[PDB]
Amino acid sequence: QIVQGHNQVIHQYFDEKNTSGVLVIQTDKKINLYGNALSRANTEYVPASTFDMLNALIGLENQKTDINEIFKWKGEKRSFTAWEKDMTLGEAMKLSAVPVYQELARRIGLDLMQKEVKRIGFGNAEIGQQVDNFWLVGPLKVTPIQEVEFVSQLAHTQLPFSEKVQANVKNMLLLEESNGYKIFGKTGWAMDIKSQVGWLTGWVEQPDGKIVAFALNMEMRSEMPASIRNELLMKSLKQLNII
Numbered sequence: 001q002i003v004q005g006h007n008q009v010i011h012q013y014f015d016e017k018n019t020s021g022v023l024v025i026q027t028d029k030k031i032n033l034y035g036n037a038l039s040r041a042n043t044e045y046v047p048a049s050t051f052d053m054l055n056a057l058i059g060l061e062n063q064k065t066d067i068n069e070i071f072k073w074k075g076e077k078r079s080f081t082a083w084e085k086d087m088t089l090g091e092a093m094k095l096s097a098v099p100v101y102q103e104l105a106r107r108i109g110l111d112l113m114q115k116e117v118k119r120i121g122f123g124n125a126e127i128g129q130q131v132d133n134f135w136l137v138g139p140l141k142v143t144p145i146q147e148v149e150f151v152s153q154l155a156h157t158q159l160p161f162s163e164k165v166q167a168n169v170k171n172m173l174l175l176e177e178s179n180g181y182k183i184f185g186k187t188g189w190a191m192d193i194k195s196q197v198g199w200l201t202g203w204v205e206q207p208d209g210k211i212v213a214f215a216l217n218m219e220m221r222s223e224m225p226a227s228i229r230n231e232l233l234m235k236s237l238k239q240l241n242i243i
């Protein structure tokens, strides 16, 4: 099941970007590890925005929102300018608009959130006490192997949510498409005074329908482009002939 993969080459790629990281790939029930810091795969980190996928699933499942709802921008200056507008849950997914995902979390509220997170068994399922930021600062944590298992199940409509809800959240996640290969996923990035953890978790849907899921997890620095996660993921996917 969980093993290291054939690759001297991906190890290099990560050293060549001057980072410590791992790339977990899950096809059917086989999980391979690649990178220059494999032990990260079993290390817990905060999911940061990658949690937006689970938030949306819980929110939609319990009818706290719907895919047509327009979340209103009330006019205050926000941490990013691209967030400064009315938007749907789907458009928030793509922009990683935290304030939408915080409104939604509050609608959900703490008891349902923690019943649902324990029900799903996400990470260490620890939400503790603040409903509106537990995925960004802790206590909630998850490993890269757990994430890839989560997105694999989302990809395959195997999570314990309605089928329509799963399909609606999948449809929010399309990043890129070319040669008939689709790539779905979600970035994440948390700025803790310790290290900074960067995520990119999602999947490839190949032309014949086959799903190959991935969870990139690396140490970020403020000097890196945000681009670097996608660049390293796409190089590695090509090298493994997944795309």
Ligand SMILES: *C(=O)[C@@H](NC(=O)/C(=N\OC(C)(C)C(=O)O)c1csc(N)n1)[C@@H]1NC(C(=O)O)=C(C[n+]2ccccc2)CS1
Pocket (backbone or CB within 6 Å): 047, 048, 049, 050, 079, 095, 096, 098, 136, 137, 187, 188, 189, 190, 191, 192, 226
């Ligand atoms: C989800 O993971 C969100 N992360 C954060 O809100 C945090 N930081 O975002 C960064 C990018 C580090 C920032 O400069 O503010 C964060 C760190 S500690 C804490 N409580 N919050 C969204 N993630 C990302 C991303 O993954 O890149 C965003 C997209 N983005 C980033 C940089 C430039 C353009 C777009 C928005 S926050």
